[PDB]
Amino acid sequence: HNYKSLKYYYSKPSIELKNLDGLYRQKVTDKGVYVWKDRKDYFVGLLGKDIEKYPQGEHDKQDAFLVIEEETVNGRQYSIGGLSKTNSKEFSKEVDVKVTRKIDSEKSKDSKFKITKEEISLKELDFKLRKKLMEEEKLYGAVNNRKGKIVVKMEDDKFYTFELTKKLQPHRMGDTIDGTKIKEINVELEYK
Amino acid sequence: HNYKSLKYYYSKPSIELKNLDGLYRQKVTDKGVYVWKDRKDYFVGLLGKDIEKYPQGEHDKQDAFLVIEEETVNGRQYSIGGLSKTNSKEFSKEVDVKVTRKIESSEKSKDSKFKITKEEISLKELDFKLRKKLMEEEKLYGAVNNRKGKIVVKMEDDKFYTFELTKKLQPHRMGDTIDGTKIKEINVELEYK
Ligand SMILES: [Cl-]
């Protein structure tokens, strides 16, 4: 069912690897990179426009946000996208999280969310915000708790949306945005 | 570099499995299905909307268009998308292929035929078979500059599907399918001499 796949995907643990010891694109014909830190290696899938940023060879000063998928790829644990430029300097910013709840009228309450990367993947935003919602707003706690959306709003009013009724598309996991320009996060939940 | 990867990728052999002996989705949490025919197994990734067509369990009356990627997945040869419902009966259709050359003005065109064997066909197959025709008949990826242009699959209702030749077909599109009986014409534009 749609519920089980959401619940058991977003309940998975995540690994934040800041400053990889390395990430390596072996072949121009493959769809991923070998990444490693502290003697732990993984294979990361490049299934969107992110493949264009990592040509054959090595690339340094990079971060990785991992969610270990069910597939074993090239003998390693696998994750899709979540790659980004490592911070140039220390950066930490708390943004407001407006959680509105349509029932039919509505109920809302504010919370905060800690941003720590200058350049951040949609994968990370998506996964961490859903986890926050699973823990605090009963997201995917019952078959009926799956409708709504997460909106990440920028200072120039551009925004990014995550539909809660389905998993973030793999081709969007490698997309990144300027963490320093995230203005606010608006969440709408359409369940009791 | 990009040119090299296009040549390499579209030079790969394809594998057409009509009426799979099996297609099994192991977990609702995974991103693919095990497929097999005539004692040969493979794992096919579901990285687009195609994932919604194969819930946990087994499925039959399916076809698979394979292109083996560099990645080994679950200890098997891996391909992305290319799944479709098998033909309900014998089906064939000859469709025109118009090839022009823009060098911004498209010159004289050469017309050829392309046979459609399936009722429901994946964008992966159309894309891969059509580029292989071009590599063989129009020097596609035969040199550094033979990579610009586009393949356009037009339907009866004027709606169309486009493949940019300067890059590989996006993985999230490989599993999308269209009605093979509704395919009207194939218009190709090559931006090189
Ligand atoms: Cl493997």
Partners of B42 on chain A (C-beta within 8 Å) are none
Residue in A9, A47, A69 closest to B171 by CB:
A47
Q: Quick check: B164 contacting A, CB < 8 Å?
A: no
Residue B160's nearest CA partner among B133, B138, B189 is B189
What is the three-class DSSP state of A98? strand
| A-to-B residue pairs, Cβ atoms closer than 8 angstroms | 68
Return the closest-CA partner of residue B184 out of B159, B150, B151, B149. Answer: B159
Quote the strand ranges of chain B, DSSP E: 14-17, 22-25, 32-37, 40-45, 57-58, 62-67, 72-73, 76-80, 83-85, 93-101, 110-116, 120-122, 149-155, 160-164, 177-179, 183-190
Looking at chain A, which residue has its C-alpha nearest residue B74? A72
Instruction: Verify that A71 and A136 share a domain, yes or no.
Output: no
Residues in chain B: 193
Range of the domain at B46: 12-86
Q: Which of A35, A174, A175, A19 is nearest to A88 (CA)?
A: A19
- Kindly state whether residues B192 and B106 are assigned to the same domain: yes
Beta bridge partner(s), residue B163: B151
Which 8-state DSSP code applies to residue A153?
A: E
Two tokens at B178?
């269209």
DSSP code, position B86: P
Q: DSSP labels for B115-165?
A: EE--SEEEHHHHHHHHHHHHHHHS-TTSSTTTT-EEEEEEETTS-EEEEET
Mutation pick from B70, B77, B147 vs chain A, by most beta carbons of A within 10 Å, is B70
3-class SS of residue B106:
strand
How many domains does chain A fold into?
A: 2
Distance CA A185, CA A153 (A): 6
With vertex at residue A7, the alpha carbon angle to CA A5 and CA A8, rounded to the nearest 5 degrees, is 65
Residues B79, B99 within the same domain: no
Burial A108-126 (b: 16+ CB within 10 A, else e): eeeeebebebbbbbbbbbb
Distance to chain A for B172, nearest Cα, Å: 7
- Give per-residue burial for B56-88: e unless 16+ CB within 10 Å, then b: eeebeebbbbbbebbbbbbebbbbbbbbbebbe
CA torsion through residues B18, B22, B27, B28, sign: positive
Chain B residues close to A72, C-beta within 8 Å:
73-75
- Contact list, B47 vs chain A (CB under 8 Å): 47, 170-171
Q: Tokens at residue B135, please? A: 């590599």
CA of B114 to the centre of ligand 1 (A): 37
Per the CB < 8 Å rule, is A8 touching B31?
Answer: no
| C-alpha dist (Å) from residue B125 to A14, A39, B3, B66, B161 | 36, 41, 21, 8, 13
B41 touches chain A (CB under 8 A): no
> What is residue A130's DSSP assignment?
H
Q: Are residues A79 and A134 in the same domain?
A: no
Which CATH number belongs to the domain containing residue B174 in this structure?
A: 3.10.20.120
Residues B7 and B76 in one domain: no
Residue B79 contacts residue B70 (beta carbons within 8 Å): no
How many C-beta neighbours within 10 Å does residue B151 have? 24
Q: After which residues is chain B broken (C to N over 2.5 A)?
A: 103
Residues 6+ positions from B57 with CB-CB distance below 8 Å:
B24, B25
Residues A79 and A106 placed together within one structural domain of the fold = no
| Residue finishing a domain among B59, B86, B113 | B86
Interface of B with A in 48-87 (CB under 8 A): 48, 55, 69-75
Contact: B71, A30; criterion CB under 8 Å: yes
- Binary contact (B28, A8; C-beta < 8 A): yes
Q: Are residues B75 and B99 in the same domain?
A: no
Give the Cα separation of A6 and B179 in Å (integer). 31
First to last CA, chain B: 22
Resolution in A: 2.4
Strands (E), chain A: 15-17, 22-25, 32-37, 40-45, 57-58, 62-66, 72-73, 76-80, 83-85, 93-102, 106-115, 119-121, 148-154, 159-163, 176-178, 182-189
| Shared-domain flag, residues B71 and B115 | no
In angstroms, rounded to a whole number, what is the distance separating the alpha carbons of residues B114 and B131?
12
User: Where residue B59 sits, what CATH number does that domain have?
Assistant: 2.40.50.110
Residue of chain B whose Cα is closest to the Cα of A10: B29
Whole-angstrom Cα distance, residue B122 to residue B127?
Answer: 9
Judging contacts by C-beta atoms under 8 Å, the chain B residues touching residue A70 are 26-27, 29-31
CA A103 vs. chain centroid, Å, equals: 28
Please indicate, yes or no, whether residues B110 and B181 belong to a single structural domain of this protein.
Answer: yes
- What element of type H or E holds B3? helix B2-11
Q: Given A41, A63, A86, which residue is the final one in a domain?
A: A86
Beta bridge partners of B106: B102
Q: Which two tokens stand for residue B147?
A: 């990579």
d(CA B164, CA B148): 8
The tokens 């971060």 sit on which residue? A63
Structure tokens given for A49: 């426009």
Distance CA B135, CA B141 (A): 6
Same domain, A49 and A129: no
* A150 beta partners: A162, A187
Give yes or no: residues A77 and A105 share one domain. no
Contacts of A35 (CB under 8 A, 6+ apart): A17, A20, A22, A23, A24, A41, A42, A43, A44, A64, A83
H-state helical runs in chain A: 2-10, 122-136
Look up residue B152 and give its two tokens: 């356009």
3-class state of residue A35 by DSSP: strand
What kind of experiment solved this structure?
X-ray
Please choose, from the candidates A45, A46, A116, the residue with its C-alpha nearest in 3D space to the C-alpha of residue A86: A116
**End of a domain among A30, A60, A86?**
A86
B101 and B7 in a single domain? The answer is: yes
Reported as type and span, the H/E element at residue A81 is: none
Which of helix, strand or coil describes residue B104?
A: coil
